[PDB]
Amino acid sequence: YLTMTQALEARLGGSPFGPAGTGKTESVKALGHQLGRFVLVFNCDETFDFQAMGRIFVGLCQVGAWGCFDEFNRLEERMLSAVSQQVQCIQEALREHSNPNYDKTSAPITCELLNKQVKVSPDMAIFITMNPGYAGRSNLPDNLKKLFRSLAMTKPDRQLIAQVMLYSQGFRTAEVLANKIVPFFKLCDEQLSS
Amino acid sequence: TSIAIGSAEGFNQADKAINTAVKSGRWVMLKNVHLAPGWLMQLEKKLHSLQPHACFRLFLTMEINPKVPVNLLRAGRIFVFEPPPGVKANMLRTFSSIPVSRICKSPNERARLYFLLAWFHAIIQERLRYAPLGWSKKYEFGESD
Amino acid sequence: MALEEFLKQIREVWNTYELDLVNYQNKCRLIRGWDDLFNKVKEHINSVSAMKLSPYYKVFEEDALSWEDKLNRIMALFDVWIDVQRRWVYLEGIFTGSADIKHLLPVETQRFQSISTEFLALMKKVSKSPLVMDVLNIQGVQRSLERLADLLGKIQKALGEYLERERSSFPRFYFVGDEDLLEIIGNSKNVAKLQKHFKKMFAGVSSIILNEDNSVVLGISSREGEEVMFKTPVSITE
Amino acid sequence: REELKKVCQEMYLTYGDGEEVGGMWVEKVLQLYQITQINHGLMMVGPSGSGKSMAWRVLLKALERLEGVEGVAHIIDPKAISKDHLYGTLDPNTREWTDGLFTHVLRKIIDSVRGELQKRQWIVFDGDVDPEWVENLNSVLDDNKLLTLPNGERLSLPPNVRIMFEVQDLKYATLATVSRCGMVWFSEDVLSTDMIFNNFLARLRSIPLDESPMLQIQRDAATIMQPYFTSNGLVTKALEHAFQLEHIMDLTRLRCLGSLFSMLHQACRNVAQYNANHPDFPMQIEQLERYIQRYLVYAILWSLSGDSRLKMRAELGEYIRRITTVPLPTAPNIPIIDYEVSISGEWSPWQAKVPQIEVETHKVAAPDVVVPTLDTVRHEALLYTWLAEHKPLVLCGPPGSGKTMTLFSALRALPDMEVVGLNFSSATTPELLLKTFDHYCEYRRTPNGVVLAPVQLGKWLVLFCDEINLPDMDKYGTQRVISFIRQMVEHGGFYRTSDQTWVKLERIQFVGACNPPTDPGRKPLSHRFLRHVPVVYVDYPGPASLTQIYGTFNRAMLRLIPSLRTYAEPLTAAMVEFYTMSQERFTQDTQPHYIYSPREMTRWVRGIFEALRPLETLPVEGLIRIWAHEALRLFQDRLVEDEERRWTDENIDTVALKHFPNIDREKAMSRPILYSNWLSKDYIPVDQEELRDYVKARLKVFYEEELDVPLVLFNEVLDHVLRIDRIFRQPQGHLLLIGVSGAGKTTLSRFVAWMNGLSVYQIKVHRKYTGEDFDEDLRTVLRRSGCKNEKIAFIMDESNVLDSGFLERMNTLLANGEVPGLFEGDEYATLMTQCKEGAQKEGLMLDSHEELYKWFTSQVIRNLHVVFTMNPSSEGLKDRAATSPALFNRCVLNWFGDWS
Amino acid sequence: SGFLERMNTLLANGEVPGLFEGDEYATLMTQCKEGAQKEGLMLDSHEE
Ligand SMILES: Nc1ncnc2c1ncn2[C@@H]1O[C@H](COP(=O)(O)OP(=O)(O)OP(=O)(O)O)[C@@H](O)[C@H]1O
Ligand SMILES: Nc1ncnc2c1ncn2[C@@H]1O[C@H](COP(=O)(O)OP(=O)(O)O)[C@@H](O)[C@H]1O
Ligand SMILES: Nc1ncnc2c1ncn2[C@@H]1O[C@H](COP(=O)(O)OP(=O)(O)O)[C@@H](O)[C@H]1O
Ligand SMILES: [Mg+2]
Ligand SMILES: [Mg+2]
């Protein structure tokens, strides 16, 4: 939450990264729901080309919704480089939305997307979720990596999650049950056959 | 005119920008050109047969990549951007990057803070040269941070 | 000899079965009860097959064979028909409820007017004799429905630019596909079919709350049944 | 459990509780149901033939019966189609979205036009999992339960839909996919062999093989075979021992069991045929029992060791004789595999059906003529048994061993099947099969769905794919065409991607041929594919078998010249000896094209016969000279280095002197062995200087008439033009000239074509040459050579190959003389018109499109000669050995090399 | 006189009813289709 709100205030995007199952997409969605935002989750792949991403960005800007692009590094490197332009334009529009001189009584703020002027709502944001450990995944160009603030989400606190979920579900012995069930999962991982 | 290479619209935009800037004398920059080596070859061939305006400048931002054609490398002038050689060079580059006015604001303490920041940066980045000891892995502590 | 009883009951059902027709905005008489008709056909085909497994089937083979053919000819006829009707319902609401589409897409408007004329003529013929067996016996009707469906599908692919403009009008339509957007625009009059398209446009809104006459939006509801009632209800007539 | 018991009873499956047989499988079904109740995404992971498919099918039926909710399963092979065809394509030009297979199925369920939301929908991904297609399901298997398409559309998973994966391994799936699914692990021990035997026997007793006398025969056969199909019985022990042996392909339990079950079904059919042919005396219990026991042990031998060497077959026979109580032949040293089972119920030697035939003198070394042999008759009987059941089968063996010959000889005994040849390459996709289906078959709409059936009514179409293990295997271990064939064989159909419609095959059968998977360029076939196809190993004929076949051929040949008859025995021997030495000297480890097979000796016999045909008399010297000339043309033309050719020369000398003593060495084998029919009417030896003068005069004419490029003659040029002329005179004779650029390969080819009257055709390639241009050029040359009876030399360089599609088209054209998908649409109509005009011009009564196309293919085969030129590269040659196999099987390879 | 008959039909009607037939008519239909989608008309029926 701290890193992503810092990115949002700087009008940048958020990039949680780490292995699978660490709660990156759900953390982004939870932060979006905490601010009452419409968070749209996209499962990106190599077919998310420049035009498709441009249209998605147009929809997000006009609606004012959050775009959580999971598996972002599955795009082709050329397509990532091309999309960096649209991301930069959207961030520039968002940044000029925060200036004090401009007020809502002036002309609406638009950005250049897909050779058209698209109004940018201030509520929109772009988040990318990726696992940089998979082999064969694309490497993000530096000009696109500089538009996102990254955070390593590698080790979720399973003990606290289990304790709180069991406590909220009505288990009277939730603390002991969690302290028994999380080490049990660790033992199953490190004791059974591979 | 800054254009990110990788899409067909990007190639068309680059061609149009170069065509207008060779006459108007404006600057064109193309980023991540190492992602299209064949278009780079044809770009070098196009650049050879031009007589542009005296103020025209084309910049090709790229990563050090063997797929880059050598004819383009010979045609243009190469500048290598890499970590500064030492702590002193790192701090000098940091102080060059930050504008003088931004450091010198009404609070007089700001400058010292900036200096501290620079030093801190110049430390950690240099520790990247010692891969297992300085850190556990090559983190990308860069200009964005 | 219960096989003869099965034949007589099937024949009685199919000579007393008629299509279920309802006026549609004072323009034609559309069909409901697609599920009932389909279930009837499926169970009759299954019973015919079970008879074909019977050891007394030979003496009633011919007649039974005839019936399955008829049943098949029913099922093939109304699998296309429903699609046709649906593609008409949300297209007639687009080429008549919109004024700029006539000027922007003249070829599509003319083609859809031709298809609408043929569909309405066929539907009047259906309304004259709503017996399912009578409608099946119309000469060259299956080919007519197949051609109608093909042409309607061809018109659907020609509305891409109009749908893009409509998306520009209401931004959330950017998260809705082409066919679903066509359905929304066509059935804007009958909001009862819009309820399944809200989950694609909103984070938690699954349906809207409407009054008896479906003219005022009293509020919204989620998928879990939770309701939010508006302080100032939205009027659809205005 | 009660519902499962009823469903398994009706499905001929074994049900059990706890420690009973089937208890573990029923527990697995219950665990699968529990996992369905918790997860919307499931993975049934386990070795091939572990009961996963039956588990989820029985669970679906039992749930439908128990809860009253109808269950519909959509089975998709995600790797038998492209990922674009599976998820959908966004057109780059018009930005219009076209649904894939999974996307279309999910959207149809979501719309629920026909009440799809009131049913239990199971989308089963029955195929390999790799992180390319399954990661697009990451949101589907995640708590989001959304399919997000690139066009911005989001499809929510309905609560009644389950996404299931039925896989045999997860060695390529990433952790992101494994963590999102509920795993059910079906061990191979879950499906015991006892349940497989019980299912086989139940289906035999309940289902008639005809479509009752047949049922009664099946019931008595099952009663006879019941003692052997028990735990620790004959079949289980035989399987346990056969697992210890080594086979040409990896052995799986269900491959052997399915082969054995097909054999037993054929045995029941044989008993029925015997009863039909003997209405007065039906087969009695004693005779039936003896016949069934003998046929059972025979089928065990031919199923559990039919894909191994003769040594392993002998070992299995010895072990069976050691363990079994079935009466067996009393021969001291003869292994059982040489004994068949007569319908009378007694062991009968195979050698009794191998007569010492005498081939006609005009049919020697003919493609159709098959000299009967022990291995030949055994393999023909096995292929008849497998084909008659319409079971897909695989012929594995070294190239030129006789797989195609054996298959066609067996198919001659089956008149109701028409065979279509397909030549797989490394670039083969299911598109080749789809083009063949478009040509030879027809899609028809029936009340049950779309059915693809052959145009000719009452006949079975047999798709003979010749290189099934060549197609490229993905980096995730999958061959797409092999997955497509497995889908067609197991599920009896495929998916038409034009409208995502399930198409059911009817009267379509699959036969494959392949080299052993240890050969370069050959990949091991998938186990899930192999369980449906029995594999029979066709090895090279031995020295005795080769001696028999080619002694018969040489006798029938030398009957032309009576004075030479006494040399039939040595000649053949010499042939065999030399061939063996060559096959032992030049192996594929040195050069990829160093492959010597009985095809070489067949061409040897055919060339000697073609030389001897017009001659009225000859000394032994002339026969030895022709023998040496054919040996030089067959074993030395492909050689690369000079020491290999020197070895070939000196060893031809040694072999000819050893097997033909008391002959004049110099008269018969003077070193410059040249033959030509240019200076006479017969293929007679020609002097080097007279040939040089004649070629000089012809070149002087050639410069003025066709190509004004002066040439310098030398002995190698004369030899090369003679070699080219030899192939330009043969039907379907294609050349592969390998040599340095500028060595005159193209010029000599054009010059020899000008002599032979061939019209030289070269594709005019430029910078913007595409696949469509090559297809148009192929149509032009095929129309000229097939519709207008024009002899054409199609000359092509490796520089002209701008894509692998060019090589695929050329591979098909060289191997078959026809490209199934080349002429289509208006092109096919115009081709049929021109073919009809050409056929009526040649005085043939042909009007049907099938016979017109067959005549066109025959004309192309007889008239088109393809010359292929490339540089002598090593990696390039090794790559082309797999990318276009026909280039090394249907093209005579001539190594011009550099000028010495 | 056949030349004048064909020309009379072509001048008066704009097409000759029997000029295109067999493979010629199929090729004409293919080209007419491609030309129609080239001009922005979606036609596949032979009559239209
Ligand atoms: N419970 C059972 N009782 C008897 N026979 C069974 C039972 N389960 C499966 N079989 C039979 O054994 C074989 C196993 O095939 P099945 O389709 O179940 O395997 P699978 O694990 O799904 O294989 P694959 O991954 O290759 O498709 C089939 O011939 C099937 O009819
Ligand atoms: N028993 C036999 N009788 C006659 N010819 C044989 C026999 N065995 C092998 N041959 C010869 O061996 C060659 C085998 O070639 P082919 O059947 O095409 O092998 P493959 O199917 O492996 O390509 C044939 O040309 C055939 O003449
Ligand atoms: N035997 C020869 N004598 C003289 N010139 C030759 C001879 N063979 C080839 N050439 C030269 O090679 C050229 C054509 O070579 P070509 O046959 O196309 O090479 P490739 O064998 O690579 O196809 C001609 O211009 C000719 O001058
Ligand atoms: Mg995620
Ligand atoms: Mg299975």
Tab-separated table of N, CA and C in Angstrom, chain B residues 37-114:
chain	number	residue	atom	x	y	z
B	37	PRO	N	16.459	-4.751	-36.132
B	37	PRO	CA	17.738	-4.615	-36.853
B	37	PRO	C	17.589	-4.409	-38.354
B	38	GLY	N	16.632	-5.075	-39.002
B	38	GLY	CA	16.456	-4.875	-40.434
B	38	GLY	C	15.987	-3.473	-40.771
B	39	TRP	N	15.028	-2.961	-39.999
B	39	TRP	CA	14.633	-1.571	-40.158
B	39	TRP	C	15.794	-0.639	-39.852
B	40	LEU	N	16.695	-1.043	-38.953
B	40	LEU	CA	17.895	-0.251	-38.701
B	40	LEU	C	18.801	-0.207	-39.927
B	41	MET	N	18.959	-1.342	-40.614
B	41	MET	CA	19.753	-1.366	-41.841
B	41	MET	C	19.158	-0.439	-42.892
B	42	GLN	N	17.844	-0.535	-43.101
B	42	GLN	CA	17.223	0.329	-44.100
B	42	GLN	C	17.238	1.791	-43.660
B	43	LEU	N	17.197	2.049	-42.349
B	43	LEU	CA	17.326	3.411	-41.846
B	43	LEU	C	18.707	3.982	-42.130
B	44	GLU	N	19.754	3.183	-41.932
B	44	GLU	CA	21.099	3.650	-42.253
B	44	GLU	C	21.232	3.929	-43.744
B	45	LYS	N	20.672	3.049	-44.578
B	45	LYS	CA	20.709	3.280	-46.019
B	45	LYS	C	19.979	4.565	-46.394
B	46	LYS	N	18.829	4.822	-45.766
B	46	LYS	CA	18.104	6.065	-46.015
B	46	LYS	C	18.900	7.276	-45.543
B	47	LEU	N	19.545	7.168	-44.381
B	47	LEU	CA	20.303	8.282	-43.824
B	47	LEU	C	21.514	8.625	-44.676
B	48	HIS	N	22.102	7.632	-45.347
B	48	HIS	CA	23.273	7.905	-46.172
B	48	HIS	C	22.951	8.892	-47.288
B	49	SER	N	21.807	8.722	-47.945
B	49	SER	CA	21.434	9.564	-49.080
B	49	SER	C	20.479	10.670	-48.630
B	50	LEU	N	20.994	11.547	-47.769
B	50	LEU	CA	20.243	12.715	-47.332
B	50	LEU	C	21.181	13.905	-47.199
B	51	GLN	N	20.621	15.097	-47.398
B	51	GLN	CA	21.315	16.364	-47.171
B	51	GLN	C	20.421	17.207	-46.275
B	52	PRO	N	20.386	16.910	-44.981
B	52	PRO	CA	19.422	17.556	-44.089
B	52	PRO	C	19.853	18.964	-43.703
B	53	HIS	N	18.987	19.609	-42.928
B	53	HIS	CA	19.261	20.939	-42.409
B	53	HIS	C	20.443	20.897	-41.445
B	54	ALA	N	21.111	22.046	-41.307
B	54	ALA	CA	22.327	22.108	-40.501
B	54	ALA	C	22.061	21.787	-39.035
B	55	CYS	N	20.854	22.059	-38.550
B	55	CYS	CA	20.516	21.834	-37.151
B	55	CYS	C	19.851	20.487	-36.900
B	56	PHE	N	19.696	19.654	-37.926
B	56	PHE	CA	19.048	18.362	-37.744
B	56	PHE	C	19.922	17.427	-36.918
B	57	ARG	N	19.293	16.722	-35.981
B	57	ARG	CA	19.967	15.722	-35.168
B	57	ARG	C	19.053	14.525	-34.965
B	58	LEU	N	19.587	13.341	-35.247
B	58	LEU	CA	18.907	12.079	-35.002
B	58	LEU	C	19.637	11.340	-33.894
B	59	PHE	N	18.897	10.943	-32.866
B	59	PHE	CA	19.422	10.167	-31.753
B	59	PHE	C	18.799	8.782	-31.791
B	60	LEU	N	19.622	7.757	-31.613
B	60	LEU	CA	19.166	6.371	-31.592
B	60	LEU	C	19.532	5.793	-30.232
B	61	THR	N	18.570	5.798	-29.315
B	61	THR	CA	18.768	5.192	-28.006
B	61	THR	C	18.653	3.683	-28.154
B	62	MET	N	19.625	2.947	-27.623
B	62	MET	CA	19.643	1.509	-27.824
B	62	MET	C	20.404	0.842	-26.692
B	63	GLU	N	20.237	-0.470	-26.609
B	63	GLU	CA	20.973	-1.296	-25.671
B	63	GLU	C	22.104	-2.003	-26.404
B	64	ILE	N	23.203	-2.238	-25.692
B	64	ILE	CA	24.352	-2.912	-26.283
B	64	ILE	C	23.931	-4.334	-26.627
B	65	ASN	N	23.786	-4.614	-27.924
B	65	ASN	CA	23.143	-5.825	-28.392
B	65	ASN	C	23.826	-6.249	-29.687
B	66	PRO	N	24.325	-7.485	-29.775
B	66	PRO	CA	25.017	-7.909	-31.005
B	66	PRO	C	24.135	-7.939	-32.242
B	67	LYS	N	22.808	-7.948	-32.095
B	67	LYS	CA	21.938	-7.922	-33.266
B	67	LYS	C	21.988	-6.595	-34.013
B	68	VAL	N	22.554	-5.552	-33.414
B	68	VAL	CA	22.629	-4.248	-34.082
B	68	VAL	C	23.554	-4.351	-35.290
B	69	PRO	N	23.150	-3.867	-36.463
B	69	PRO	CA	24.030	-3.938	-37.636
B	69	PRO	C	25.287	-3.105	-37.439
B	70	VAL	N	26.392	-3.579	-38.018
B	70	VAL	CA	27.651	-2.855	-37.895
B	70	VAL	C	27.721	-1.676	-38.853
B	71	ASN	N	26.936	-1.690	-39.933
B	71	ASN	CA	26.912	-0.541	-40.832
B	71	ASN	C	26.333	0.687	-40.140
B	72	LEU	N	25.292	0.495	-39.328
B	72	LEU	CA	24.765	1.592	-38.523
B	72	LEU	C	25.784	2.055	-37.490
B	73	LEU	N	26.513	1.113	-36.888
B	73	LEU	CA	27.530	1.478	-35.907
B	73	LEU	C	28.628	2.322	-36.539
B	74	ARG	N	29.043	1.969	-37.757
B	74	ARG	CA	30.073	2.742	-38.441
B	74	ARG	C	29.538	4.087	-38.914
B	75	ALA	N	28.280	4.125	-39.361
B	75	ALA	CA	27.716	5.366	-39.884
B	75	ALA	C	27.608	6.435	-38.806
B	76	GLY	N	27.168	6.055	-37.606
B	76	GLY	CA	26.943	7.000	-36.536
B	76	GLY	C	28.071	7.024	-35.516
B	77	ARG	N	27.949	7.958	-34.579
B	77	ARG	CA	28.904	8.108	-33.491
B	77	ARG	C	28.316	7.505	-32.226
B	78	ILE	N	29.092	6.647	-31.572
B	78	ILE	CA	28.617	5.813	-30.473
B	78	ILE	C	29.007	6.455	-29.152
B	79	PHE	N	28.050	6.535	-28.232
B	79	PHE	CA	28.295	6.965	-26.861
B	79	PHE	C	27.780	5.881	-25.928
B	80	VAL	N	28.655	5.379	-25.063
B	80	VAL	CA	28.327	4.280	-24.164
B	80	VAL	C	27.937	4.860	-22.815
B	81	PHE	N	26.753	4.487	-22.340
B	81	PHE	CA	26.253	4.886	-21.033
B	81	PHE	C	26.257	3.667	-20.124
B	82	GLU	N	26.915	3.794	-18.980
B	82	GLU	CA	27.156	2.680	-18.077
B	82	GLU	C	27.349	3.237	-16.670
B	83	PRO	N	27.469	2.403	-15.638
B	83	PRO	CA	27.694	2.933	-14.287
B	83	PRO	C	28.953	3.776	-14.230
B	84	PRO	N	28.938	4.864	-13.463
B	84	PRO	CA	30.135	5.687	-13.345
B	84	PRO	C	31.279	4.884	-12.762
B	85	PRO	N	32.515	5.173	-13.175
B	85	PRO	CA	33.647	4.330	-12.754
B	85	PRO	C	33.858	4.271	-11.251
B	86	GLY	N	33.542	5.335	-10.519
B	86	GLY	CA	33.781	5.335	-9.090
B	86	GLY	C	32.814	6.188	-8.296
B	87	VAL	N	33.075	6.324	-6.995
B	87	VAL	CA	32.212	7.130	-6.137
B	87	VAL	C	32.264	8.594	-6.552
B	88	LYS	N	33.469	9.108	-6.810
B	88	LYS	CA	33.608	10.510	-7.189
B	88	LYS	C	32.891	10.803	-8.500
B	89	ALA	N	33.059	9.932	-9.497
B	89	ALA	CA	32.380	10.128	-10.772
B	89	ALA	C	30.869	10.017	-10.613
B	90	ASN	N	30.413	9.092	-9.767
B	90	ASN	CA	28.982	8.954	-9.513
B	90	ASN	C	28.407	10.226	-8.903
B	91	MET	N	29.095	10.784	-7.903
B	91	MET	CA	28.615	12.013	-7.279
B	91	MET	C	28.664	13.184	-8.251
B	92	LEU	N	29.701	13.246	-9.088
B	92	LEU	CA	29.796	14.315	-10.076
B	92	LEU	C	28.649	14.242	-11.074
B	93	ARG	N	28.342	13.037	-11.559
B	93	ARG	CA	27.223	12.874	-12.481
B	93	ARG	C	25.901	13.208	-11.805
B	94	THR	N	25.743	12.815	-10.539
B	94	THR	CA	24.522	13.138	-9.810
B	94	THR	C	24.342	14.645	-9.680
B	95	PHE	N	25.409	15.355	-9.307
B	95	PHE	CA	25.313	16.803	-9.160
B	95	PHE	C	25.122	17.496	-10.502
B	96	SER	N	25.650	16.917	-11.581
B	96	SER	CA	25.404	17.472	-12.907
B	96	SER	C	23.952	17.279	-13.326
B	97	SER	N	23.355	16.141	-12.966
B	97	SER	CA	21.988	15.854	-13.391
B	97	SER	C	20.981	16.772	-12.708
B	98	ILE	N	21.130	16.990	-11.407
B	98	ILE	CA	20.169	17.825	-10.678
B	98	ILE	C	20.407	19.290	-11.026
B	99	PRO	N	19.372	20.045	-11.394
B	99	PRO	CA	19.565	21.469	-11.687
B	99	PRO	C	20.042	22.232	-10.460
B	100	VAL	N	20.804	23.298	-10.713
B	100	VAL	CA	21.360	24.099	-9.626
B	100	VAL	C	20.247	24.762	-8.825
B	101	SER	N	19.224	25.273	-9.515
B	101	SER	CA	18.131	25.956	-8.828
B	101	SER	C	17.376	25.011	-7.902
B	102	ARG	N	17.178	23.763	-8.330
B	102	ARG	CA	16.415	22.812	-7.525
B	102	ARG	C	17.120	22.511	-6.208
B	103	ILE	N	18.444	22.347	-6.246
B	103	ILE	CA	19.197	22.135	-5.014
B	103	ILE	C	19.178	23.393	-4.156
B	104	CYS	N	19.323	24.558	-4.787
B	104	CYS	CA	19.429	25.827	-4.066
B	104	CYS	C	18.048	26.470	-3.979
B	105	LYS	N	17.255	25.981	-3.030
B	105	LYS	CA	15.963	26.565	-2.710
B	105	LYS	C	16.082	27.419	-1.451
B	106	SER	N	14.944	27.944	-0.997
B	106	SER	CA	14.950	28.780	0.200
B	106	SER	C	15.456	28.055	1.447
B	107	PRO	N	15.116	26.790	1.720
B	107	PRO	CA	15.756	26.109	2.858
B	107	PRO	C	17.214	25.815	2.537
B	108	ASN	N	18.116	26.311	3.386
B	108	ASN	CA	19.541	26.125	3.140
B	108	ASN	C	20.006	24.708	3.441
B	109	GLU	N	19.267	23.964	4.265
B	109	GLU	CA	19.630	22.585	4.567
B	109	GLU	C	19.456	21.659	3.372
B	110	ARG	N	18.566	22.009	2.437
B	110	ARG	CA	18.240	21.125	1.322
B	110	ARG	C	19.494	20.627	0.621
B	111	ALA	N	20.399	21.545	0.274
B	111	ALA	CA	21.616	21.162	-0.430
B	111	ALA	C	22.334	20.035	0.293
B	112	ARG	N	22.564	20.191	1.601
B	112	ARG	CA	23.259	19.143	2.337
B	112	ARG	C	22.521	17.821	2.218
B	113	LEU	N	21.197	17.844	2.404
B	113	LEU	CA	20.412	16.631	2.223
B	113	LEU	C	20.688	16.019	0.861
B	114	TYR	N	20.588	16.831	-0.198
B	114	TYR	CA	20.884	16.333	-1.535
B	114	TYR	C	22.253	15.679	-1.571
